[PDB]
Amino acid sequence: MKPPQQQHEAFPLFKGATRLPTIWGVPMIPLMAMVMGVAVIALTVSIWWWALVPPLWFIMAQITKNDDKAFRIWWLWIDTKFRNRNKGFWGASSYSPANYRKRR
Amino acid sequence: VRDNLAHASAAMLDVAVLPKPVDLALEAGYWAQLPANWQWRPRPAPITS
Amino acid sequence: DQKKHRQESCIKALEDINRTLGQSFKRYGAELLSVYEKGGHAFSAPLE
Structure with a gap:
């Protein structure tokens, strides 16, 4: 059927949605992760390796511009469905209902 | 359940809100339903009240 | 088998x-x- 529809009276929705706080067009938290990683590489192997910044930084800008919140999804997956140990045994990631906190 | 998901996607697209099935954050979304869980929400996007 | 999978996917989509x-x-x-x-x-009927 046709429940209530629009006739240009619809309440405006502005596209300031998910315009995340970005510097150079990239969010703070993932760019800081890249800074930490490249700093680790620079301190570990060689010091010529702050040239690893612009390539991955540009690829991250292209990723963020297309799909503004990819990194939050990435971190959620990594934290939850990647940590869960017995993925293989169950055929799927499962959490026991009864609270077996290793106590007795 | 996939058939119903495709149906729901068609329904949402009919009213001009482009949906994309959650694939990597299925568990995060499913734990984002319980009230008082902001740390588990996949895509929080600010909007007018 | 994957040819069949494409088959039902297309049939269901077109039927919707x-x-x-x-x-x-x-x-x-x-x-x-x-x-x-x-x-x-x-x-x-269509072939006509």
Whole structure:
């Protein structure tokens, strides 16, 4: 059927949605992760390796511009469905209902 | 359940809100339903009240 | 088997399209053409 529809009276929705706080067009938290990683590489192997910044930084800008919140999804997956140990045994990631906190 | 998901996607697209099935954050979304869980929400996007 | 998978995916998608068009042509008197049988044999309506 046709429940209530629009006739240009619809309440405006502005596209300031998910315009995340970005510097150079990239969010703070993932760019800081890249800074930490490249700093680790620079301190570990060689010091010529702050040239690893612009390539991955540009690829991250292209990723963020297309799909503004990819990194939050990435971190959620990594934290939850990647940590869960017995993925293989169950055929799927499962959490026991009864609270077996290793106590007795 | 996939058939119903495709149906729901068609329904949402009919009213001009482009949906994309959650694939990597299925568990995060499913734990984002319980009230008082902001740390588990996949895509929080600010909007007018 | 994956040819079959593509088969049901396309059939279901197109069948949803057909239902939506039928519901959208209520005032247009639309009629989806389909197989009809004459004399113990299958005669196609679209093929005509």
